[PDB]
A paper describes a structure:
S100A8 and S100A9 constitute two of the most potent pro-inflammatory molecules among the S100 protein family. As for all their congeners, S100A8 and S100A9 form homodimers as a minimal, active unit. As for all S100 proteins, S100A8, S100A9, and their heterodimer bind two calcium ions per monomer, one in each EF-hand motif.
Surprisingly, in the structure derived from crystal form 2, four zinc ions per homodimer were present in addition to the four calcium ions. A closer inspection of the structure revealed that only one of the two symmetrical Zn-sites found in crystal form 1 was strictly conserved (Zn2) whereas the second site (Zn1) was instead replaced by a (Zn)2-cacodylate complex, the cacodylate molecule coming from the crystallization condition. In this new site, Zn1 (crystal form 2) occupies almost the same position as Zn1 from crystal form 1 and is coordinated by His17 from monomer A and His83 from monomer B. The two other coordinating His residues are however replaced by a chloride ion and by one of the hydroxyl groups of the cacodylate molecule. Instead, His27 from monomer A and His87 from monomer B are flipped by 70 and 100°, respectively. As a consequence, His27 now coordinates the second Zn2+ (Zn3) from the (Zn)2-cacodylate complex which is further held in place by His91 from monomer B, by a second chloride ion and by the second hydroxyl group of the cacodylate molecule. Despite this quite large rearrangement of one of the Zn-sites in crystal form 2, the resulting S100A8 homodimer structure remains unaffected and superimposes well with the homodimer from crystal form 1, with an overall root-mean-square deviation (r.m.s.d.) on Cα atoms of 0.464 Å. In crystal form 2, helix H4 only interacts with Glu57 from a symmetry-related molecule due to the presence of the (Zn)2-cacodylate complex.
Author numbering:
A (entry chain C): 1 to 93
B (entry chain A): 1 to 89
Write the structure that this text describes.
Amino acid sequence: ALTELEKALNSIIDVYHKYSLIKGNFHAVYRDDLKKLLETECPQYIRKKGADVWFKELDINTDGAVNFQEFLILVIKMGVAAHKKSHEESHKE
Amino acid sequence: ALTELEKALNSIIDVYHKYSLIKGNFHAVYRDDLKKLLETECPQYIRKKGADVWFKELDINTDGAVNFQEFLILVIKMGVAAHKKSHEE
Ligand SMILES: C[As](C)(=O)[O-]
Ligand SMILES: [Ca+2]
Ligand SMILES: [Ca+2]
Ligand SMILES: [Ca+2]
Ligand SMILES: [Ca+2]
Ligand SMILES: [Cl-]
Ligand SMILES: [Cl-]
Ligand SMILES: [Cl-]
Ligand SMILES: [Cl-]
Ligand SMILES: [Zn+2]
Ligand SMILES: [Zn+2]
Ligand SMILES: [Zn+2]
Ligand SMILES: [Zn+2]
């Protein structure tokens, strides 16, 4: 049996693999792959920046693809934004 | 509606609040609280480091607790490790 934290991380892994297995290297999310990822998995405040802008920022080692480690940058920024908004809703700030 | 990615993040947030709401400042996880988190939410290869060792690593500003930002360090390291180990055995 897995813990909720373990199942959450495996879910994030499955989301990445969903788009990394589309073509080419199995641990590479290419520009067009990331576009479909943003439109399907991400909310509007993430989408508005566009796939081209996100791809350029996420491609840390500049190899023309997004690996899982680079993908976590997007995941964490979403997590922070989600937590920040929920914190601002519980408190009438 | 919520995407699979959004739900996973909410679960992670819920996991942190589960231990931060125990006592004192509700936005802070203390040493005993972290030990509880590690023993309940984390796999063996993560636990083997030690609760005291993990706490010193996570409490980077040394205010005596792990806040949400510091907690994400653990989440990131666990995520990388889980992915790496999922492609083994
Ligand atoms: C609802 As809260 C513990 O993020 O202030
Ligand atoms: Ca690929
Ligand atoms: Ca890259
Ligand atoms: Ca607390
Ligand atoms: Ca701290
Ligand atoms: Cl950005
Ligand atoms: Cl609170
Ligand atoms: Cl908090
Ligand atoms: Cl592999
Ligand atoms: Zn919080
Ligand atoms: Zn609060
Ligand atoms: Zn506040
Ligand atoms: Zn993988």
